[PDB]
Amino acid sequence: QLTWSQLPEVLESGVLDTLSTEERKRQEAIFEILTSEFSYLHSLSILVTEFLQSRELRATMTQTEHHHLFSNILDVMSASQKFFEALEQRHKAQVCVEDISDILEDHAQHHFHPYIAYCSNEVYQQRTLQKLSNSNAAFRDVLKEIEKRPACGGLPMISFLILPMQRVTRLPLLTDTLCLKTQGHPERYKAASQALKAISKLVKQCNEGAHKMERTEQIYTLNMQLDFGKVKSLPLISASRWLLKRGELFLLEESSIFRKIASRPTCYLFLFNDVLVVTKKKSEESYLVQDYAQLDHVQVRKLEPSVPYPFQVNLLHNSEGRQEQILLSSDSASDRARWITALTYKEKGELPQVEVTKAYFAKQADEITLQQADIVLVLQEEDGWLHGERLLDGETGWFPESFAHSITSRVAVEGNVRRMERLRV
Structure with a gap:
């Protein structure tokens, strides 16, 4: 709930009286990355504690089914912790943090490899959960009881398992906002940009890995x-x-x-x-x-x-x-x-823009999964369905038009277009 401006230590320092509004925003930008990172790390711990480390659930599956379901969540969770720790030390050390772009770039280049494997394994993870739910009686019963427990927060297991994929897609947006708010100091902006390039490179590797693994499974199965x-x-x-x-x-x-x-x-x-x-x-x-x-x-x-x-x-x-x-x-x-x-299939900015209002998960090869606040350019509208290209990565898909609302105000429209160019491959 609290923002950097409301933080007790920032008040006592009383740096608010003399501080450019842009800097106040850079510190809120850095604070958002750290605050968002902790909630994800905590949500990951619930997945590990209530689901991964559930003996009863392991008993309903086979040595192999467990690996596909949960994958390297332990490796992904470990990566998130070390990252949060680096950012936290910077947060505790000074009231106004100098830079976090060095941590952003370093981790994305050398310690964010688990996400690529975790993201690529999504095709298997999804089919393993579906096979288990449809044909494993023992599984269905045990999972409901774990889901009933208070710690899950009445979130289902699937929503925990998709969290690493969601965070990595949003990491560039948080890093972007920082780049925008670091423009005031010339030396820092370059480093912040270094981060976005490394962060955006990591998302591309994860997206490509998911496609290579998913299409490779489809071509062999269909063959x-x-x-x-x-x-x-x-x-x-x-x-x-x-x-x-x-x-x-x-x-x-x-x-x-x-x-x-x-x-x-x-x-x-x-x-x-x-x-x-x-x-x-x-x-x-x-x-x-x-x-x-x-x-x-x-x-x-x-x-x-x-x-x-x-x-x-x-x-x-x-x-x-x-x-x-x-x-x-x-x-x-x-x-x-x-x-x-x-x-x-073989055959700009005047493209209508919509903003996702409700998270939507693709049910077919045509469709494109969308989480809330994702922007999508609209290519075609038919019978309550929109064919659109995801603003963040350029992936194009169909999704129901009920999950999004029209953005008409140019200042927003042209902001997203100028913003999409910065992260465009």
Whole structure:
């Protein structure tokens, strides 16, 4: 609750009477990094004490399941503590802290490596929790009882496990504000900038690691599931191929006008960044490929209108070297837009800006996870869904428009745009 200005030691010193307002802000900026860091470190300790070190929870899982669930949280927690400790000594030593940029850069360059591993392991962590919740009875019971305990603060385990990822994404914002407020001293500003570059570099490494691990898992898992026996074999595995969107769609026939809303034939699409694969789902883990085509040679178009939201996918060069047209429909206007936006994947400042109001977690390959106060540029709006590019890292995704509110005041708008340029890769 207390701010640096309200801090008892700062009052007794009475440095307030003679101190530039910008410096008061630099000290509040440094104080925010330390105060935010402690709350996270405390939240990490709850995760370690109530969940990681729960013998009963370990008893419900296997030696291997525990590693995926919790990962190197002990290593990540240890990294956070040493960092807070360095910052704290500076805070205790003097009423007005000279610099913390040296600690910011040093830790990001040499001691923040655990975050990259922890962030990259998210794909496994998520699937491990889901498998445990859906099919492990013993797990569900024990976790609820731990969640009921007062220390968790009636926060669920998942929200603790996502905290390291959230902090590292916000570290550049806190360091940025410092750079803005360190402009007054020339020598310090350069060091503060050194920090943002190192801090922003670390986020890039964590973001890339998450993508490499997640796409590598998807390409191997999908490679087994897609059965290319009937058609000309296509090598799916590649270190470059990733999944744009997957989904079931309704097959449309022009032969019959009188369609039904029951027992409608369907097809399942896997759309990769460079290839579209048309399959028909046999099991939950087998899909029989019917055709495929390079995204260079795929056209998409809305169909003139029941079975609403129809669209036509044209394979100009198909698996057999020929041309084929697929007529599909979806029962969601927003869903059709997401398929067209993906299928046209190959194809500034006047971009409407929105600010996240409620944390949103991505449920699909299209979507982009967003936490509160994240800014997102808006690219397309359809049926209550916004296709947008995250201001912090440039990642683009869909999310419901209900989680954000329009920012119209230019002074804010152009501030975020000028601010995004500073952290732009």
